[PDB]
Amino acid sequence: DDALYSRQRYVLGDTAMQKMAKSHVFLSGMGGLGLEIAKNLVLAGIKAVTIHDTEKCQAWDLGTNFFLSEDDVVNKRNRAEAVLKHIAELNPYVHVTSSSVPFNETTDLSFLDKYQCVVLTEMKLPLQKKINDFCRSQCPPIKFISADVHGIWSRLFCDFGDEFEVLDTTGEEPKEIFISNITQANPGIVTCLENHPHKLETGQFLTFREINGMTGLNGSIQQITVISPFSFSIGDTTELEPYLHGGIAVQVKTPKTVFFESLERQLKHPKCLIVDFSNPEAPLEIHTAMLALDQFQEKYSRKPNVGCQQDSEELLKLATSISETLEEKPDVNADIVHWLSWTAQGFLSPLAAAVGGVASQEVLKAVTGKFSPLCQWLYLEAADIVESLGKPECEEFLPRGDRYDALRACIGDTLCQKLQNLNIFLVGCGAIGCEMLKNFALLGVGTSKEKGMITVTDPDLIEKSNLNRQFLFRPHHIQKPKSYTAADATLKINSQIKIDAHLNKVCPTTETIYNDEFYTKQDVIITALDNVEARRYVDSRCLANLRPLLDSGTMGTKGHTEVIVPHLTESYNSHRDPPEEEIPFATLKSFPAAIEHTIQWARDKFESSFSHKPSLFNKFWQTYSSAEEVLQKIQSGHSLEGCFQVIKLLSRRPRNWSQCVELARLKFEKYFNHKALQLLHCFPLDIRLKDGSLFWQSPKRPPSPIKFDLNEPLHLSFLQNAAKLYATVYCIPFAEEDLSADALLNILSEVKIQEFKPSNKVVQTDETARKPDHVPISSEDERNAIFQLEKAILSNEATKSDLQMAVLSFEKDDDHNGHIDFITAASNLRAKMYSIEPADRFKTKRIAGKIIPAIATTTATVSGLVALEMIKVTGGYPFEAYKNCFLNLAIPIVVFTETTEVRKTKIRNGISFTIWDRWTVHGKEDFTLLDFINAVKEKYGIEPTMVVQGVKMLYVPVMPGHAKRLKLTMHKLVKPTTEKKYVDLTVSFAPDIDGDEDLPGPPVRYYFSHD
Amino acid sequence: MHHHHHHMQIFVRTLTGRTITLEVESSDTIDNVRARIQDREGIPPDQQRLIFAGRQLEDGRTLADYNIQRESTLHLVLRLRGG
């Protein structure tokens, strides 16, 4: 619908968005978890949300609620009504209402049938079951979600009714398969193109098109059985005509039905999503413990008290009795029960952040039918935060009357103060970065008076389309810096927070700012970036300075977190990400097969016509001054680079608006008519190769010329936008009345169209061609350039105004500049020329603009998970406590896993090193190179055979005469001035087997004196 | 003494609902499994991150070293670039 919804429209699709524009969600309980959910839903664009709560504000709530203020507490405002205006501001298209009416077991639940989904937090279990029974039995069922965080534990439950239709189960687009052969048999066997496995699984359904020969399969649906990576069987083809060539098969996506059971029944036979397959039995063990807590609250009307031995013994007894009533008779996990009784009255905000993201995506699934919902329980937990504590005393967990009581009751005061003392470096300040700053604020990061500081940096100003997933930015913040605005907002959440906001990007050209001393001062670096290059760069800096790094990322419903800890793990750069897709040169230029190929071609044509060529033109005449000088230098045998292309542009320069339309008309004829005729001249429709096969075999598609017709809206759109862009480049003023179809037809009415003339130009067919480098200039071309250069000088068409052009910059998010409209028209005209299915403007924009789909739900989820890992880094936890996470909420699937174990590289004699090792030798003034060699051997066990300083070869014994360098002092050998203190050297060693290459060791830092 | 050869079938699942069924030997290295996945998917080994039972599988080790058995499930995971 809107430019506010652009990035997330690509996640959900237009059909799902429209259902969200008609949905009313009821959310009860506005503690920390309800607030997170409400924030996500309003950002995602649910049309109406009612936030319900019956409780007054309390000082404790300031620790878990990022919209509450101390003024709310002194006035004892209702929790839902206090945050209502802050939530409403997240986007004024959403209707946010508050309710504070009582809500108990005598309440008539009929008012709930106004809602499509009900979300319940902080609600007693008996009432949950009563509401669940009501919801699931409505004539259309009201979808039901229950979610809670207690201390370091959480519970998420979905019940979308007896039969729920999922319209798209995976969120993945149907793949296309090219057919190579089909046999006449029962069953018939399909073979796909060589070197392209079909990647299909038995049972999937396919449709077919463009098969030549075997008439009867086109337009049919076939269920396949995989035979090999390249072949599968379909139906009976014995009676059909023989297969000749061609054919494309497309996966059909079938709607699926999911069955849900009541909360009451699911409590006794729970279906749990397994998020850590090292402990597949843990979710049922948590289910048991958390049901015991509900029974404790019902029996005693309170939660257990920390340190009260009788309370935890009772919770264990309830847990033990529940376990006997379950089907498997699962042993009770006494550790889970103990830590649940310990922390029950606390509340872990980053866990609520993560649960709130998942639960919000589940609400979206409930009202759209997009993606397969959770079925039916999720038990995200933060046990890895406390296991290292052992069994501490409870004094450290008791409330102290500050905003950190909720957190302290989870992790203890020692760890809280370590968080308050953190220096952390937050790189990037967009969607993830805004969620991180809010998570830091609730944790107290960097609030200590003594130590502690959040440094956040981002080079960007705030724009529209950022207010979707970045909840700290408002429309009145447009043109304000992201880092400054987010910093100011975080201070409102927590007034003790100390933040230093920069306007820089972290890259090689700012390494003098973010130098080694800067990283050494940080405790942890956290990335919130939108590209792989920045991630690998920051990683190289953290590795060089022995600092931990927490990375994360999203794409739509997909997300990851990665933990990098010195001496414990590998770093980010130990793995490679998928590169940008490389469309082969010949495919892009001559033989497109997909709409992606014509979109890239249109994007490249915009860049060539309106950016690259104008700037080459400008730089050429800036370098060579005037046309008379270039003419004199060409006739004297000199050759200037790009000269012939410049003169062509000079001679064809349009002088008025009319000539801009004529140029645009000429380009239409070249791109969408002549190109087709030229390829057919080189490769006639029926031309064959030496092997007797057709040249126009899949994936190649023959072009067909297009006849220009101003009555075609696609042709008019091309002519309009091409003409106005050429008018911009050539500085020709134009009014919007000159763009009318009537005004355009008159300008072209008496303009002759040049008939097509073929050439014997060679067109590359190799899929590994990669540009023809540079063709040498011909004798005819130089002769034609001189003719055009003289013709421009004689007719005074080479003045100063003629020697410059305006350079455009591709801007995807301004609809009035015509950039996207030009690309869409050019791409779809080229697609029609090749009988490729066109794409609408929104799809073309996504692909041309390299836009990455994003939704606040995933963003909030991975940010909560990163904050949990940051607590572990703060505490110096062991390797086993850390978790990477790889997730896709579309499925849903969550894979926690231990992070990458640090690897050992063997030097020799059992001596190994890791990426984190750095060796040091401390010399004195008379310390020689021989001293250095002996010092390395004595300290580290092996003698160096090579010493290098960058590219300077300090000592290479195999080079003639280097033995004399052993007696030289290290001062005279190195010659230092930039770093007075030390020099960083590269040291190598003799290999195990003689004659092989010397083995590199850790970097070695040599200190010239003892200081 | 040398053991009997133990052939097995394992499943490599993506996080997008796909399943790759692999015919392997228990003595296969993790390196060899990445090569087989490259043959089936076109994914270069240095882009493949494989998770089994909450641990990340590394080169230089065998399926048996990781206690991977008949009908075991591995997950093929990726890092995302948005933020």
Ligand SMILES: O=P(O)(O)O[C@H]1[C@H](OP(=O)(O)O)[C@@H](OP(=O)(O)O)[C@H](OP(=O)(O)O)[C@@H](OP(=O)(O)O)[C@H]1OP(=O)(O)O
């Ligand atoms: O610079 P490019 O973006 O790579 O486009 C060029 C350019 O076409 P346009 O400038 O009209 O957009 C050439 O025309 P000139 O400006 O050099 O006169 C044209 O050459 P011909 O007109 O002689 O065919 C050539 O096409 P080709 O290489 O098939 O000869 C075509 O290349 P692309 O459109 O494929 O990029």
Ligand SMILES: *O=P([O])([O])O[C][C]1O[C](N2[C]=NC3=C2N=[C]N=C3[N])[C]([O])[C]1[O]
């Ligand atoms: O994902 P979002 O677009 O919401 O935020 C990404 C954010 O990262 C910033 N960024 C990109 N590259 C950077 C960087 N910050 C600091 N250093 C480097 N190299 C970008 O400005 C976005 O706002």
